[PDB]
Design a binder for this molecule. Structure first.
Ligand SMILES: *[C@@H]1O[C@H](CO)[C@@H](O[C@@H]2O[C@H](CO)[C@@H](O[C@@H]3O[C@H](CO)[C@@H](O)[C@H](O)[C@@H]3O)[C@H](O)[C@H]2NC(C)=O)[C@H](O)[C@H]1NC(C)=O
Ligand SMILES: *[C@@H]1O[C@H](CO)[C@@H](O[C@@H]2O[C@H](CO)[C@@H](O[C@@H]3O[C@H](CO)[C@@H](O)[C@H](O)[C@@H]3O)[C@H](O)[C@H]2NC(C)=O)[C@H](O)[C@H]1NC(C)=O
Ligand SMILES: *[C@@H]1O[C@H](CO)[C@@H](O[C@@H]2O[C@H](CO)[C@@H](O)[C@H](O)[C@H]2NC(C)=O)[C@H](O)[C@H]1NC(C)=O
Ligand SMILES: *[C@@H]1O[C@H](CO)[C@@H](O)[C@H](O)[C@H]1NC(C)=O
Lengths: 172, 321
């Protein structure tokens, strides 16, 4: 995708994450764990539902039309009837092919985008108390107990609290 | 001794292949089908009024072939013609059959109003063993076969004004005898003529005498014609032989009515979209069941499947086997 996260700097996905689309894995002194990010997950899902609902929007209802199968050879009028229908079908078949190609490219790019938004947001939250390892993982340079991890994940992590500690560990 | 926090995304064990701008096949976590490719094989009886033709074409029901008498005054949203249909009356053709079938199908009714035509100096209600009604000879219910009275067939000259506020459809015909003997026996004059007109149009038909292939006991034929008479206009019919006269008019309507050729059985269910293969659901935007449809239908495309991605790129862990 355009943002280089999914199938990019993030090596692969997590089959274990069954309660969300994007999320967090951590290691600290208390062990290791996993949690889904609801907001990113919901942003992707809402966009995908949005496009799905636009695409399946019922828009055509037709009644009496032209005949499209013929039991007799007739020539000119029938040639025209068949050509009109064949023309229509090819144009609609093209529309359908193009639609799915554009939609799917965009769905891949928007999902890649949402991964990237979460990663950049997290990075910003951590300010100077962490470093980007380059594989979607932050090395956090201080004691970050489970209350501290959950603080990062639920948007309450105050970086000032841990800054002196972390700055010291980083420039040694 | 610090901590690691890794950002990631889900994956699934069984992803689906989709098409994009750059890839003809690439794997995502889920997708949904946009092409309806199946039918139940049955035509749902709601919400459209379905009239099963059974043994009858719409034209045979219109003319009043005796085995189609059950269709008198019928109405429909969709008239269904079956491949088993047959004609069993006087052999006939309709120049521009397809147009008459179309305009009647689209009108959605066979409502017929009898009018008091006065046919001075001819015998009415002619019949044939080619078109039995009960045990004896008969004819199309909506047509009146006129022949000589005594030894004469005078010039027929009649009128019917349209003083209603709706259009009238008149169905009439011309008899083509197979021999000169038949021509003169029935109509006296050696050559007939039928002229049917309104203020702005006219149709004149000259009969041709000669054998056509023997069908249901006749080498003769009737050719069927039609004339629409608008409010304030008038019908005139003028003939010195061979007229197959109208008995009245059909009431024309406009609306959503049509006709379809299908052998699918009619069943109790609800479906907006009908194809000759049967009803199909209309939740998907495209379909590959049949280019012939009626109602609120997906659009026909050539593809039998098109997958809309409903999830991210599916990236499983690098496989160790
Ligand atoms: C991933 O997308 C697929 C579509 O390709 C989803 O499958 C569909 O799931 C829905 C909801 O469970 C099914 O609708 C239900 O169908 C049953 C009939 O079996 C009906 O009784 C219910 O009222 C409802 O309409 C649908 O059948 C199913 N379609 C197919 C082709 O499998 C699937 O749910 C999605 N999964 C995830 C995790 O997003
Ligand atoms: C064959 O039958 C038609 C239908 O009745 C006859 O047409 C009618 O002919 C008369 C004249 O012979 C027309 O009368 C004229 O009407 C105008 C307008 O009202 C009036 O101002 C004139 O002084 C005159 O009386 C009549 O309108 C006409 N009607 C129609 C519906 O066409 C026709 O004459 C008959 N032909 C033969 C040879 O018998
Ligand atoms: C619906 O009916 C059509 C038309 O009867 C089917 O297509 C015909 O049958 C096979 C298709 O494999 C071919 O031999 C014919 O050439 C087809 N006819 C036409 C006019 O295309 C079609 O397969 C049916 N579809 C379903 C889902 O039942
Ligand atoms: C058909 O309808 C007309 C009026 O709409 C009526 O006069 C006629 O008798 C009806 N005939 C039958 C057979 O239902």
């Amino acid at each position: 995708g355009l943002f280089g996260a999914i199938a990019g700097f993030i090596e692969n996905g997590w089959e274990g994450m069954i309660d969300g689309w994007y999320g967090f894995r951590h290691q600290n002194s208390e062990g290791t764990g996993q949690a889904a990010d609801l907001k990113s997950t919901q942003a992707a899902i809402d966009q995908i539902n949005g496009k799905l609902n636009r695409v399946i929007e019922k828009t055509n209802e037709k009644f009496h039309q032209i005949e499209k199968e013929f039991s007799e050879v007739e020539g000119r009028i029938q040639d025209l009837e068949k050509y009109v229908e064949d023309t229509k079908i090819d144009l609609w078949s093209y529309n359908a092919e193009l639609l799915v190609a554009l939609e799917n490219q965009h769905t891949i790019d928007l999902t890649d985008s949402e991964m990237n938004k979460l990663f950049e947001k997290t990075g910003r939250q951590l300010r100077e108390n962490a470093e980007d390892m380059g594989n979607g993982c932050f090395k956090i340079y201080h004691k970050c107990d489970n209350a501290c991890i959950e603080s990062i994940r639920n948007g309450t992590y105050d970086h000032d609290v841990y800054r002196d500690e972390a700055l010291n560990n980083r420039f040694q | 001794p610090g901590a690691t926090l890794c950002l990631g995304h889900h994956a699934v064990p069984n992803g689906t292949l989709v098409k994009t701008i750059t890839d003809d096949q690439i794997e995502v976590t889920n997708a949904t089908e946009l092409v309806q490719s199946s039918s139940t094989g049955k035509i749902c009886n709601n919400p459209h009024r379905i009239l099963d033709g059974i043994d009858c074409t719409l034209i045979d029901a219109l003319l009043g072939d005796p085995h189609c008498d059950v269709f008198q005054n019928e109405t429909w949203d969709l008239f269904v013609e079956r491949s088993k249909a047959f004609s069993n009356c006087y052999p006939y053709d309709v120049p521009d059959y397809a147009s008459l079938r179309s305009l009647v199908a689209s009108s959605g009714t066979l409502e017929f109003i009898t009018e008091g035509f006065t046919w001075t100096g001819v015998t009415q209600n002619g019949g044939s063993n080619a078109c039995k009604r009960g045990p004896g000879s008969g004819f199309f219910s909506r047509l009146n076969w006129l022949t000589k009275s005594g030894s004469t067939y005078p010039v027929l000259n009649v009128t019917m004004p349209n003083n209603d506020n709706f259009d009238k459809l008149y169905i009439w015909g011309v008899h083509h005898p197979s021999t000169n003997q038949e021509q003169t026996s029935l109509y006296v004059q050696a050559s007939g003529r039928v002229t049917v007109s309104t203020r702005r149009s006219q149709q004149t038909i000259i009969p041709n005498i000669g054998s056509r292939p023997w069908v249901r006991q006749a080498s003769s034929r009737i050719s069927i014609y039609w004339t629409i008479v608008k409010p304030g206009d008038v019908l005139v019919i003028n003939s010195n032989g061979n007229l197959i006269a109208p008995r009245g008019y059909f009431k024309m309507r406009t609306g959503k009515s049509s006709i379809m050729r299908s052998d699918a059985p009619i069943d109790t269910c609800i479906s907006e979209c009908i194809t000759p293969n049967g009803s199909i659901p209309n939740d998907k935007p495209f379909q590959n069941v049949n280019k012939i449809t009626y109602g609120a239908c997906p659009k026909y495309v050539k593809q039998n499947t098109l997958k809309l991605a409903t999830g991210m790129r599916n990236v499983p862990e690098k496989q160790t086997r």
